[PDB]
Ligand binder design. Structure first.
Ligand SMILES: [Ba+2]
Ligand SMILES: [Ba+2]
Ligand SMILES: [Ba+2]
Ligand SMILES: [Ba+2]
Lengths: 123, 123, 123, 123
């Protein structure tokens, strides 16, 4: 584990897990720090990739942060995971309930209705 | 097929498929006729059984109806089946969409998060 | 266990545990279903008998219900038992407290007062 | 086919078909993603070239996107083509109608008028 803040050539502050292998660096769980206490936002809200590879030629400064920001970052990154798991449980329960109710509703049906059901499902 | 209206000892009018075997009669797709044009309602809205067996000692009159009521009954009994099939398709599509979205959401997860997911699902 | 709804000659819907032995049937934990969701009420609120015996000649239809009503009936029949037990605990605690307080109050008394107490209790 | 979102040094998000051959990359059907649901806009609205060649030294991150954005991008890129074809049909029909009407109008003319027509067309 290695948490190091950095400043991008664009002019923004990125905090996350860093790995510097061969110049090009790998970033995990990156967060944009908005100056405003502190506010953190997702860096790449359009991708699900765990790691993002960038080039060291496009980063200005890489430095270790103070402990308060470390605590805030850890708290935020565990709250997000907890909420994600809670939503997964909610979705699974709703899916199970809907499937059971649909099964019971479909159970009471006639033969011709079942044939029409199959035909329209095929269509 | 045999459609015969009847009047119950309670004082209500039941229309549906009738079968008189050994005194006790079997009724399918029974409908209560409300005097008000004509209005039909389900007879036993708390059961999913296709056939209901009653005793001939508890029915006053059993007579064949006119053609207009036959047409209305057939129209209503096909509209109900059509709506039932449409709702079955709606439910199946919603279930499939929800399952797919939950699968994609669960795909992006970490190992420790997956372990916590499994533990809480077991609980 | 056997839950079957039935319709009485009076024109009401009874749900509960049923046992058909020799024509005459035994009913346990009967509930009147009021058409209004669903609302259930006690059938015989003036008796404490667990089982009630009626005659099959006085019942119109006996049919198995759908699963939603089964779930509602089970929930209601466990909530009633839970509330009954809670009230039993409340009454026992109140009785114990009152008895203890009366005992301490009676402890501080004189001999002539005790004799008058005994005489008036005898009266 | 290969759809990968990327972030430019300018600070914008480009989604489209990507091909990385020799460092310099080729982009087809590029779209600017405006953060606002999602909104997509054309990247180069002043050129008709199918492919645009850029340099990898001018791109920060290249990552695969999630499925929702893929679906939205495919829907938008088929709607645009459908509308383009519809407009082509509209224009062709209008041109044919105008040409036919002009032909019929020109048919009814005199010899001297035809000579003046030819002279002024030559001018
Ligand atoms: Ba540097
Ligand atoms: Ba009779
Ligand atoms: Ba009977
Ligand atoms: Ba690069």
């Amino acid at each position: 584990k290695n948490i190091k803040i950095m400043r991008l050539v664009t002019g923004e502050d990125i905090i996350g897990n860093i790995s510097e292998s061969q110049g090009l660096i790998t970033i995990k769980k990156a967060f944009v720090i908005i100056p405003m206490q502190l506010v953190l936002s997702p860096w790449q809200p359009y991708t699900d990739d765990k790691e993002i590879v960038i080039d060291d030629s496009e980063v200005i400064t890489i430095t270790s942060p103070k402990d308060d920001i470390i605590k805030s970052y850890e708290s935020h990154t565990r709250v997000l995971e907890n909420k994600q798991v809670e939503e997964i449980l909610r979705l699974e329960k709703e899916i199970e309930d809907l499937q059971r109710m649909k099964e019971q509703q479909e159970l009471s049906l006639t033969e011709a209705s079942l044939q029409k059901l199959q035909e329209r499902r095929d269509q």
